[PDB]
Ligand binder design. Structure first.
Ligand SMILES: Cc1cc2nc3c(=O)[nH]c(=O)nc-3n(C[C@H](O)[C@H](O)[C@H](O)COP(=O)(O)OP(=O)(O)OC[C@H]3O[C@@H](n4cnc5c(N)ncnc54)[C@H](O)[C@@H]3O)c2cc1C
Length: 458
Protein backbone atom coordinates (compact mmCIF):
# COMPACT_ATOMS: atom_id res chain seq x y z
CA UNK A 1 0.00 0.00 0.00
CA UNK A 2 1.58 3.21 -1.32
CA UNK A 3 1.10 6.86 -0.36
CA UNK A 4 -1.08 8.33 -3.14
CA UNK A 5 0.77 11.66 -3.38
CA UNK A 6 4.21 10.02 -3.54
CA UNK A 7 3.00 7.64 -6.25
CA UNK A 8 1.38 10.51 -8.16
CA UNK A 9 4.67 12.43 -8.08
CA UNK A 10 6.56 9.38 -9.28
CA UNK A 11 4.16 8.66 -12.15
CA UNK A 12 4.30 12.27 -13.28
CA UNK A 13 8.12 12.33 -13.30
CA UNK A 14 8.51 8.92 -14.99
CA UNK A 15 8.37 8.56 -18.77
CA UNK A 16 8.57 4.72 -18.87
CA UNK A 17 6.11 1.89 -18.32
CA UNK A 18 4.92 0.74 -14.92
CA UNK A 19 3.89 -2.91 -14.67
CA UNK A 20 1.64 -3.81 -11.76
CA UNK A 21 0.66 -7.26 -10.40
CA UNK A 22 -2.80 -7.03 -12.03
CA UNK A 23 -1.31 -6.36 -15.49
CA UNK A 24 -1.29 -9.16 -18.04
CA UNK A 25 2.44 -8.81 -18.72
CA UNK A 26 3.45 -8.94 -15.04
CA UNK A 27 4.31 -12.64 -14.93
CA UNK A 28 6.64 -12.55 -17.92
CA UNK A 29 8.14 -9.22 -16.77
CA UNK A 30 9.12 -10.57 -13.34
CA UNK A 31 10.94 -13.64 -14.67
CA UNK A 32 14.75 -13.57 -14.62
CA UNK A 33 17.20 -15.97 -16.22
CA UNK A 34 17.53 -18.05 -13.03
CA UNK A 35 14.09 -19.70 -13.14
CA UNK A 36 14.45 -21.05 -9.61
CA UNK A 37 13.78 -17.48 -8.43
CA UNK A 38 10.04 -16.86 -8.43
CA UNK A 39 9.28 -13.51 -6.85
CA UNK A 40 6.41 -11.02 -7.01
CA UNK A 41 7.39 -7.33 -7.02
CA UNK A 42 4.93 -4.65 -5.99
CA UNK A 43 5.85 -2.80 -9.19
CA UNK A 44 8.18 -3.08 -12.16
CA UNK A 45 9.42 0.30 -13.47
CA UNK A 46 10.78 0.01 -17.01
CA UNK A 47 13.10 3.00 -17.10
CA UNK A 48 13.87 4.76 -20.35
CA UNK A 49 16.40 7.44 -19.34
CA UNK A 50 18.55 8.69 -16.50
CA UNK A 51 15.72 10.93 -15.18
CA UNK A 52 13.45 7.84 -15.09
CA UNK A 53 16.02 6.09 -12.92
CA UNK A 54 16.27 9.17 -10.67
CA UNK A 55 12.48 9.15 -10.28
CA UNK A 56 12.37 5.42 -9.51
CA UNK A 57 15.21 5.53 -6.96
CA UNK A 58 13.66 8.50 -5.15
CA UNK A 59 10.21 6.87 -5.18
CA UNK A 60 11.66 3.65 -3.74
CA UNK A 61 13.49 5.59 -1.01
CA UNK A 62 10.44 7.68 -0.10
CA UNK A 63 8.11 4.65 -0.12
CA UNK A 64 10.42 2.25 1.70
CA UNK A 65 10.24 -0.29 -1.12
CA UNK A 66 12.93 -2.93 -1.40
CA UNK A 67 14.93 -2.10 -4.54
CA UNK A 68 15.89 -4.64 -7.15
CA UNK A 69 17.87 -3.29 -10.07
CA UNK A 70 17.78 -5.23 -13.36
CA UNK A 71 20.18 -4.99 -16.27
CA UNK A 72 20.21 -8.23 -18.26
CA UNK A 73 18.58 -10.40 -15.58
CA UNK A 74 21.46 -12.90 -15.34
CA UNK A 75 22.07 -12.74 -11.59
CA UNK A 76 22.98 -16.24 -10.48
CA UNK A 77 21.75 -15.19 -7.03
CA UNK A 78 18.40 -13.96 -8.33
CA UNK A 79 19.04 -10.37 -7.25
CA UNK A 80 17.21 -8.64 -10.12
CA UNK A 81 13.70 -9.45 -8.85
CA UNK A 82 12.23 -9.03 -5.37
CA UNK A 83 9.10 -9.87 -3.41
CA UNK A 84 7.01 -6.84 -2.50
CA UNK A 85 9.38 -4.13 -3.67
CA UNK A 86 10.21 -2.28 -6.87
CA UNK A 87 12.20 -3.60 -9.82
CA UNK A 88 14.09 -0.69 -11.37
CA UNK A 89 14.34 -2.34 -14.80
CA UNK A 90 16.96 -0.91 -17.14
CA UNK A 91 16.45 -3.30 -20.06
CA UNK A 92 15.03 -0.63 -22.37
CA UNK A 93 18.17 1.52 -21.83
CA UNK A 94 20.23 -0.27 -24.50
CA UNK A 95 21.95 2.52 -26.48
CA UNK A 96 25.67 2.55 -27.34
CA UNK A 97 27.52 5.54 -28.77
CA UNK A 98 30.83 4.56 -30.41
CA UNK A 99 33.56 6.96 -31.51
CA UNK A 100 35.84 5.25 -33.99
CA UNK A 101 38.41 8.03 -33.85
CA UNK A 102 38.62 8.21 -30.06
CA UNK A 103 38.11 4.46 -29.54
CA UNK A 104 35.38 5.06 -26.95
CA UNK A 105 32.00 3.50 -26.30
CA UNK A 106 29.36 4.98 -24.01
CA UNK A 107 26.77 2.35 -23.22
CA UNK A 108 23.62 2.61 -21.17
CA UNK A 109 23.20 0.51 -18.06
CA UNK A 110 20.62 -1.90 -19.50
CA UNK A 111 22.62 -3.04 -22.52
CA UNK A 112 23.04 -6.68 -23.43
CA UNK A 113 26.54 -7.79 -24.41
CA UNK A 114 25.57 -8.57 -27.99
CA UNK A 115 24.08 -5.13 -28.51
CA UNK A 116 27.35 -3.64 -27.25
CA UNK A 117 29.58 -5.88 -29.36
CA UNK A 118 27.49 -5.24 -32.47
CA UNK A 119 27.86 -1.50 -31.97
CA UNK A 120 31.62 -1.53 -31.40
CA UNK A 121 32.26 -4.06 -34.18
CA UNK A 122 30.57 -1.73 -36.70
CA UNK A 123 33.99 0.03 -36.40
CA UNK A 124 36.07 -3.14 -35.95
CA UNK A 125 36.43 -2.28 -32.25
CA UNK A 126 35.79 -4.17 -29.02
CA UNK A 127 36.47 -4.31 -25.32
CA UNK A 128 36.35 -7.32 -22.95
CA UNK A 129 33.05 -8.71 -21.69
CA UNK A 130 31.36 -12.06 -21.04
CA UNK A 131 31.03 -14.96 -23.43
CA UNK A 132 27.23 -15.27 -23.72
CA UNK A 133 25.59 -12.56 -25.81
CA UNK A 134 22.39 -12.06 -23.82
CA UNK A 135 24.11 -11.43 -20.48
CA UNK A 136 23.60 -7.89 -19.18
CA UNK A 137 26.51 -5.46 -19.39
CA UNK A 138 25.40 -3.82 -16.13
CA UNK A 139 25.86 -6.53 -13.60
CA UNK A 140 28.77 -8.10 -15.46
CA UNK A 141 30.88 -4.95 -15.50
CA UNK A 142 30.08 -3.95 -11.91
CA UNK A 143 31.49 -7.26 -10.67
CA UNK A 144 34.59 -7.10 -12.92
CA UNK A 145 33.70 -8.82 -16.19
CA UNK A 146 35.86 -11.35 -18.00
CA UNK A 147 35.83 -13.25 -21.28
CA UNK A 148 37.73 -13.92 -24.52
CA UNK A 149 39.53 -10.56 -24.62
CA UNK A 150 40.57 -10.46 -20.94
CA UNK A 151 43.97 -12.11 -21.07
CA UNK A 152 44.94 -9.54 -23.71
CA UNK A 153 43.05 -6.45 -22.54
CA UNK A 154 41.99 -7.14 -18.92
CA UNK A 155 38.64 -7.19 -17.19
CA UNK A 156 35.76 -5.06 -18.46
CA UNK A 157 36.48 -2.77 -15.52
CA UNK A 158 40.13 -2.38 -16.63
CA UNK A 159 38.73 -0.60 -19.72
CA UNK A 160 36.09 1.48 -17.93
CA UNK A 161 36.95 5.20 -17.81
CA UNK A 162 33.83 6.72 -16.24
CA UNK A 163 30.26 6.02 -15.18
CA UNK A 164 27.11 8.03 -14.74
CA UNK A 165 25.49 6.78 -11.56
CA UNK A 166 22.26 7.51 -9.65
CA UNK A 167 22.90 7.34 -5.91
CA UNK A 168 20.42 6.46 -3.18
CA UNK A 169 19.66 10.12 -2.46
CA UNK A 170 18.50 10.52 -6.06
CA UNK A 171 21.59 12.43 -7.12
CA UNK A 172 23.29 11.93 -10.49
CA UNK A 173 27.08 11.68 -10.31
CA UNK A 174 29.93 11.12 -12.69
CA UNK A 175 32.66 8.84 -11.30
CA UNK A 176 36.06 8.53 -12.98
CA UNK A 177 39.76 8.65 -12.15
CA UNK A 178 39.45 12.45 -11.69
CA UNK A 179 35.92 12.88 -10.29
CA UNK A 180 34.61 10.98 -7.22
CA UNK A 181 37.50 8.52 -7.55
CA UNK A 182 36.49 6.77 -4.33
CA UNK A 183 33.18 5.82 -5.92
CA UNK A 184 34.95 4.98 -9.17
CA UNK A 185 37.16 2.49 -7.35
CA UNK A 186 34.11 0.90 -5.68
CA UNK A 187 31.97 0.47 -8.84
CA UNK A 188 34.87 -1.42 -10.45
CA UNK A 189 34.07 -4.68 -8.70
CA UNK A 190 31.65 -3.64 -5.94
CA UNK A 191 28.48 -4.52 -7.83
CA UNK A 192 25.27 -2.52 -7.57
CA UNK A 193 26.00 -1.49 -3.98
CA UNK A 194 26.62 2.21 -4.69
CA UNK A 195 23.84 3.21 -7.05
CA UNK A 196 22.34 2.54 -10.45
CA UNK A 197 24.86 2.96 -13.29
CA UNK A 198 22.97 4.56 -16.18
CA UNK A 199 25.98 4.91 -18.51
CA UNK A 200 29.36 3.19 -18.74
CA UNK A 201 32.24 4.68 -20.80
CA UNK A 202 34.93 2.31 -22.14
CA UNK A 203 38.15 2.49 -24.04
CA UNK A 204 38.12 0.24 -27.11
CA UNK A 205 40.60 -1.84 -29.06
CA UNK A 206 40.88 -2.85 -32.70
CA UNK A 207 39.89 -6.55 -32.89
CA UNK A 208 39.67 -8.02 -36.38
CA UNK A 209 39.09 -11.72 -37.15
CA UNK A 210 40.00 -14.24 -34.49
CA UNK A 211 41.21 -17.79 -35.11
CA UNK A 212 39.07 -20.03 -32.88
CA UNK A 213 38.71 -23.72 -32.13
CA UNK A 214 36.25 -25.81 -30.20
CA UNK A 215 36.60 -29.54 -29.68
CA UNK A 216 35.75 -32.39 -27.32
CA UNK A 217 38.03 -34.82 -25.51
CA UNK A 218 37.00 -38.11 -23.94
CA UNK A 219 37.25 -38.30 -20.17
CA UNK A 220 39.55 -41.29 -20.83
CA UNK A 221 42.15 -38.75 -22.04
CA UNK A 222 41.07 -36.18 -19.43
CA UNK A 223 44.03 -36.33 -17.04
CA UNK A 224 46.53 -35.61 -19.79
CA UNK A 225 44.36 -32.89 -21.37
CA UNK A 226 43.85 -31.01 -18.10
CA UNK A 227 47.51 -31.38 -17.15
CA UNK A 228 48.53 -30.06 -20.58
CA UNK A 229 46.14 -27.13 -20.12
CA UNK A 230 47.35 -26.19 -16.65
CA UNK A 231 51.02 -26.55 -17.63
CA UNK A 232 50.63 -24.64 -20.88
CA UNK A 233 48.67 -21.71 -19.49
CA UNK A 234 51.25 -20.96 -16.78
CA UNK A 235 53.56 -19.62 -19.49
CA UNK A 236 51.22 -18.90 -22.42
CA UNK A 237 51.30 -15.49 -24.06
CA UNK A 238 48.41 -13.14 -23.34
CA UNK A 239 47.11 -13.64 -26.90
CA UNK A 240 46.06 -17.26 -26.23
CA UNK A 241 42.88 -18.02 -24.30
CA UNK A 242 41.96 -21.64 -23.70
CA UNK A 243 39.07 -22.77 -21.50
CA UNK A 244 37.75 -26.20 -20.52
CA UNK A 245 34.06 -26.92 -20.05
CA UNK A 246 33.31 -30.37 -18.72
CA UNK A 247 29.79 -31.35 -19.78
CA UNK A 248 27.71 -33.97 -21.49
CA UNK A 249 28.55 -33.91 -25.17
CA UNK A 250 25.76 -32.15 -27.13
CA UNK A 251 24.03 -34.17 -29.90
CA UNK A 252 25.61 -32.31 -32.77
CA UNK A 253 26.68 -33.78 -36.11
CA UNK A 254 30.40 -33.00 -35.72
CA UNK A 255 30.51 -35.52 -32.86
CA UNK A 256 30.03 -39.26 -33.32
CA UNK A 257 26.63 -40.31 -32.04
CA UNK A 258 28.20 -42.69 -29.54
CA UNK A 259 29.61 -39.67 -27.67
CA UNK A 260 26.29 -37.78 -27.46
CA UNK A 261 25.10 -37.35 -23.92
CA UNK A 262 28.28 -38.68 -22.32
CA UNK A 263 30.70 -36.62 -20.18
CA UNK A 264 33.47 -34.91 -22.17
CA UNK A 265 35.85 -31.99 -21.94
CA UNK A 266 34.67 -29.24 -24.33
CA UNK A 267 37.82 -27.21 -24.95
CA UNK A 268 37.50 -23.80 -26.59
CA UNK A 269 40.42 -21.61 -27.54
CA UNK A 270 41.23 -18.48 -29.47
CA UNK A 271 44.15 -16.30 -30.47
CA UNK A 272 43.75 -12.53 -30.21
CA UNK A 273 46.17 -11.46 -32.93
CA UNK A 274 47.24 -12.45 -36.41
CA UNK A 275 45.14 -15.46 -37.49
CA UNK A 276 48.09 -17.20 -39.17
CA UNK A 277 49.97 -17.18 -35.86
CA UNK A 278 46.65 -18.07 -34.27
CA UNK A 279 46.39 -21.21 -36.37
CA UNK A 280 49.85 -22.38 -35.31
CA UNK A 281 49.14 -21.57 -31.67
CA UNK A 282 45.79 -23.36 -31.57
CA UNK A 283 47.20 -26.41 -33.33
CA UNK A 284 49.92 -26.50 -30.67
CA UNK A 285 47.27 -26.93 -27.93
CA UNK A 286 44.72 -29.14 -29.72
CA UNK A 287 46.41 -32.54 -29.60
CA UNK A 288 47.09 -33.46 -25.95
CA UNK A 289 44.21 -35.86 -26.55
CA UNK A 290 42.32 -36.87 -29.69
CA UNK A 291 40.10 -33.87 -30.64
CA UNK A 292 36.57 -35.09 -31.45
CA UNK A 293 34.07 -32.79 -33.12
CA UNK A 294 36.72 -30.18 -33.97
CA UNK A 295 35.43 -26.83 -35.31
CA UNK A 296 38.10 -24.37 -36.42
CA UNK A 297 37.13 -20.99 -37.82
CA UNK A 298 38.43 -17.49 -38.43
CA UNK A 299 35.60 -15.50 -36.87
CA UNK A 300 34.68 -11.83 -36.63
CA UNK A 301 34.96 -10.98 -32.94
CA UNK A 302 31.19 -10.43 -32.88
CA UNK A 303 30.71 -14.07 -34.01
CA UNK A 304 33.14 -15.39 -31.38
CA UNK A 305 31.06 -13.51 -28.81
CA UNK A 306 27.86 -15.15 -30.16
CA UNK A 307 29.31 -18.68 -30.31
CA UNK A 308 29.10 -19.88 -26.71
CA UNK A 309 27.83 -22.41 -25.84
CA UNK A 310 27.60 -25.37 -28.24
CA UNK A 311 23.98 -26.52 -28.53
CA UNK A 312 22.51 -23.01 -28.09
CA UNK A 313 20.10 -24.10 -25.33
CA UNK A 314 18.96 -21.59 -22.70
CA UNK A 315 18.36 -23.57 -19.48
CA UNK A 316 15.42 -22.70 -17.26
CA UNK A 317 16.89 -23.43 -13.80
CA UNK A 318 20.47 -22.96 -12.57
CA UNK A 319 22.62 -23.28 -9.45
CA UNK A 320 26.30 -22.31 -9.31
CA UNK A 321 29.19 -22.92 -6.95
CA UNK A 322 32.49 -21.27 -7.83
CA UNK A 323 35.90 -20.33 -6.48
CA UNK A 324 39.44 -19.49 -7.56
CA UNK A 325 42.56 -21.65 -7.49
CA UNK A 326 46.11 -20.50 -7.18
CA UNK A 327 47.15 -23.81 -8.72
CA UNK A 328 45.52 -26.91 -10.16
CA UNK A 329 47.16 -29.92 -8.59
CA UNK A 330 46.94 -33.48 -9.87
CA UNK A 331 44.70 -34.27 -6.91
CA UNK A 332 42.33 -31.46 -7.75
CA UNK A 333 42.33 -32.55 -11.37
CA UNK A 334 41.27 -36.08 -10.34
CA UNK A 335 38.47 -34.64 -8.23
CA UNK A 336 37.22 -32.54 -11.16
CA UNK A 337 37.20 -35.55 -13.51
CA UNK A 338 35.42 -37.73 -10.96
CA UNK A 339 32.68 -35.18 -10.37
CA UNK A 340 32.34 -34.46 -14.11
CA UNK A 341 31.63 -38.15 -14.68
CA UNK A 342 28.55 -37.70 -12.47
CA UNK A 343 27.01 -34.81 -14.42
CA UNK A 344 23.27 -35.49 -14.86
CA UNK A 345 21.83 -32.66 -16.91
CA UNK A 346 22.88 -31.97 -20.53
CA UNK A 347 23.04 -28.25 -19.62
CA UNK A 348 25.39 -28.45 -16.63
CA UNK A 349 29.03 -27.48 -17.07
CA UNK A 350 32.02 -27.86 -14.77
CA UNK A 351 33.99 -24.89 -16.06
CA UNK A 352 37.79 -24.54 -15.76
CA UNK A 353 38.92 -21.04 -16.70
CA UNK A 354 42.34 -19.46 -16.81
CA UNK A 355 42.61 -15.70 -16.42
CA UNK A 356 46.00 -14.28 -15.56
CA UNK A 357 47.63 -12.31 -18.37
CA UNK A 358 46.56 -8.68 -18.40
CA UNK A 359 44.09 -9.21 -15.54
CA UNK A 360 46.95 -10.09 -13.19
CA UNK A 361 49.16 -7.15 -14.20
CA UNK A 362 46.77 -4.60 -12.69
CA UNK A 363 47.82 -3.84 -9.09
CA UNK A 364 45.57 -5.54 -6.55
CA UNK A 365 44.39 -2.28 -4.98
CA UNK A 366 43.66 -0.42 -8.24
CA UNK A 367 40.01 -1.66 -8.27
CA UNK A 368 37.55 -3.38 -5.97
CA UNK A 369 37.88 -6.67 -7.96
CA UNK A 370 39.60 -9.29 -5.73
CA UNK A 371 41.85 -12.24 -6.60
CA UNK A 372 43.56 -11.01 -9.76
CA UNK A 373 46.54 -13.10 -8.65
CA UNK A 374 44.62 -16.39 -8.71
CA UNK A 375 44.54 -17.43 -12.35
CA UNK A 376 42.23 -20.42 -12.23
CA UNK A 377 38.45 -20.24 -11.83
CA UNK A 378 36.32 -23.31 -11.35
CA UNK A 379 32.56 -22.95 -11.73
CA UNK A 380 30.26 -25.87 -10.97
CA UNK A 381 27.39 -24.47 -13.07
CA UNK A 382 24.42 -26.78 -12.74
CA UNK A 383 21.63 -26.04 -15.16
CA UNK A 384 18.50 -28.00 -15.94
CA UNK A 385 14.84 -27.87 -16.97
CA UNK A 386 12.65 -30.01 -14.77
CA UNK A 387 11.48 -28.20 -11.60
CA UNK A 388 11.07 -31.54 -9.84
CA UNK A 389 14.78 -32.30 -10.22
CA UNK A 390 16.25 -29.28 -8.41
CA UNK A 391 17.76 -31.13 -5.51
CA UNK A 392 19.87 -33.53 -7.50
CA UNK A 393 21.51 -30.80 -9.57
CA UNK A 394 21.99 -28.51 -6.63
CA UNK A 395 23.58 -31.39 -4.71
CA UNK A 396 26.03 -32.04 -7.56
CA UNK A 397 27.30 -28.47 -7.43
CA UNK A 398 27.41 -28.32 -3.63
CA UNK A 399 29.27 -31.58 -3.16
CA UNK A 400 31.73 -30.89 -5.97
CA UNK A 401 32.51 -27.52 -4.38
CA UNK A 402 32.97 -29.13 -0.97
CA UNK A 403 35.23 -31.82 -2.41
CA UNK A 404 37.44 -29.08 -3.90
CA UNK A 405 37.25 -26.73 -0.89
CA UNK A 406 40.88 -27.38 0.14
CA UNK A 407 41.92 -25.90 -3.19
CA UNK A 408 39.39 -23.12 -3.64
CA UNK A 409 39.64 -19.61 -2.28
CA UNK A 410 37.84 -16.36 -2.86
CA UNK A 411 34.89 -16.20 -5.19
CA UNK A 412 33.71 -14.13 -8.11
CA UNK A 413 30.72 -12.14 -6.87
CA UNK A 414 29.05 -12.64 -10.25
CA UNK A 415 29.01 -16.45 -9.86
CA UNK A 416 27.40 -16.51 -6.39
CA UNK A 417 24.17 -18.38 -5.82
CA UNK A 418 21.09 -17.23 -3.85
CA UNK A 419 22.33 -18.89 -0.64
CA UNK A 420 25.81 -17.34 -0.71
CA UNK A 421 25.23 -13.98 1.02
CA UNK A 422 27.72 -15.24 3.65
CA UNK A 423 30.57 -15.42 1.12
CA UNK A 424 31.03 -11.66 0.58
CA UNK A 425 33.79 -11.05 3.11
CA UNK A 426 35.85 -13.97 1.96
CA UNK A 427 35.36 -13.12 -1.70
CA UNK A 428 36.70 -9.58 -1.31
CA UNK A 429 39.14 -10.08 1.56
CA UNK A 430 39.33 -7.99 4.70
CA UNK A 431 41.09 -4.93 3.29
CA UNK A 432 38.88 -4.52 0.22
CA UNK A 433 35.73 -5.26 2.22
CA UNK A 434 36.64 -2.56 4.74
CA UNK A 435 37.32 0.03 2.02
CA UNK A 436 34.05 -0.91 0.30
CA UNK A 437 32.13 -0.46 3.57
CA UNK A 438 33.59 3.03 3.82
CA UNK A 439 32.43 3.98 0.33
CA UNK A 440 29.04 2.44 1.19
CA UNK A 441 28.81 4.59 4.30
CA UNK A 442 29.36 7.66 2.14
CA UNK A 443 27.11 6.90 -0.83
CA UNK A 444 24.50 4.38 0.39
CA UNK A 445 24.39 4.77 4.18
CA UNK A 446 20.83 3.40 4.43
CA UNK A 447 21.68 0.32 2.31
CA UNK A 448 18.94 1.14 -0.19
CA UNK A 449 20.77 -1.05 -2.75
CA UNK A 450 20.93 -4.41 -0.99
CA UNK A 451 19.93 -6.89 -3.72
CA UNK A 452 23.50 -7.61 -4.78
CA UNK A 453 26.48 -9.30 -3.14
CA UNK A 454 25.86 -6.85 -0.38
CA UNK A 455 28.35 -4.63 1.43
CA UNK A 456 26.66 -3.13 4.51
CA UNK A 457 27.82 0.40 5.37
CA UNK A 458 30.28 1.47 8.04
C1 LIG B 1 24.70 -17.40 -19.40
C2 LIG B 1 25.61 -16.52 -18.58
C3 LIG B 1 26.92 -16.33 -18.98
C4 LIG B 1 27.78 -15.53 -18.23
N1 LIG B 1 29.08 -15.42 -18.63
C5 LIG B 1 29.87 -14.63 -17.95
C6 LIG B 1 31.20 -14.40 -18.48
O1 LIG B 1 31.66 -14.93 -19.48
N2 LIG B 1 31.97 -13.57 -17.71
C7 LIG B 1 31.57 -12.99 -16.55
O2 LIG B 1 32.35 -12.17 -16.05
N3 LIG B 1 30.32 -13.20 -16.05
C8 LIG B 1 29.51 -13.96 -16.75
N4 LIG B 1 28.23 -14.19 -16.28
C9 LIG B 1 27.85 -13.64 -14.99
C10 LIG B 1 27.37 -12.23 -15.02
O3 LIG B 1 28.51 -11.39 -14.87
C11 LIG B 1 26.49 -11.96 -13.81
O4 LIG B 1 25.39 -12.88 -13.89
C12 LIG B 1 25.98 -10.54 -13.88
O5 LIG B 1 25.47 -10.11 -12.62
C13 LIG B 1 24.92 -10.41 -14.95
O6 LIG B 1 24.49 -9.05 -15.03
P1 LIG B 1 23.04 -8.71 -15.52
O7 LIG B 1 22.90 -7.22 -15.69
O8 LIG B 1 22.67 -9.59 -16.68
O9 LIG B 1 22.20 -9.23 -14.26
P2 LIG B 1 21.05 -8.69 -13.32
O10 LIG B 1 20.46 -9.87 -12.66
O11 LIG B 1 20.15 -7.78 -14.04
O12 LIG B 1 21.85 -7.85 -12.26
C14 LIG B 1 22.98 -8.42 -11.58
C15 LIG B 1 23.37 -7.57 -10.40
O13 LIG B 1 23.88 -6.30 -10.86
C16 LIG B 1 23.02 -5.24 -10.49
N5 LIG B 1 22.90 -4.36 -11.65
C17 LIG B 1 22.68 -4.72 -12.96
N6 LIG B 1 22.76 -3.71 -13.80
C18 LIG B 1 23.06 -2.63 -12.99
C19 LIG B 1 23.28 -1.26 -13.27
N7 LIG B 1 23.27 -0.76 -14.49
N8 LIG B 1 23.61 -0.45 -12.23
C20 LIG B 1 23.66 -0.97 -11.00
N9 LIG B 1 23.46 -2.24 -10.62
C21 LIG B 1 23.16 -3.02 -11.67
C22 LIG B 1 21.74 -5.89 -9.99
O14 LIG B 1 21.13 -5.11 -8.97
C23 LIG B 1 22.27 -7.20 -9.41
O15 LIG B 1 22.84 -7.06 -8.11
C24 LIG B 1 27.32 -14.94 -17.05
C25 LIG B 1 26.01 -15.10 -16.66
C26 LIG B 1 25.17 -15.90 -17.42
C27 LIG B 1 23.84 -16.22 -16.85
Amino acid sequence: QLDPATLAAFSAAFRGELIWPSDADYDEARRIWNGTIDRRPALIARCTSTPDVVAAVSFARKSGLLVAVRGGGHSMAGHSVCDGGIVIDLSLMNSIKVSRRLRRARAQGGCLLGAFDTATQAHMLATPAGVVSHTGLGGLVLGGGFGWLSRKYGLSIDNLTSVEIVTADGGVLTASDTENPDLFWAVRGGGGNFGVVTAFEFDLHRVGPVRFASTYYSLDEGPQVIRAWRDHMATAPDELTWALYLRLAPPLPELPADMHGKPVICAMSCWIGDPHEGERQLESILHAGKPHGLTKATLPYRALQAYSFPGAVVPDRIYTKSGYLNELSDEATDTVLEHAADIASPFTQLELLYLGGAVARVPDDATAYPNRQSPFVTNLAAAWMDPTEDARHTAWAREGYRALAGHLSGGYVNFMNPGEADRTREAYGAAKFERLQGVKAKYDPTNLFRLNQNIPPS
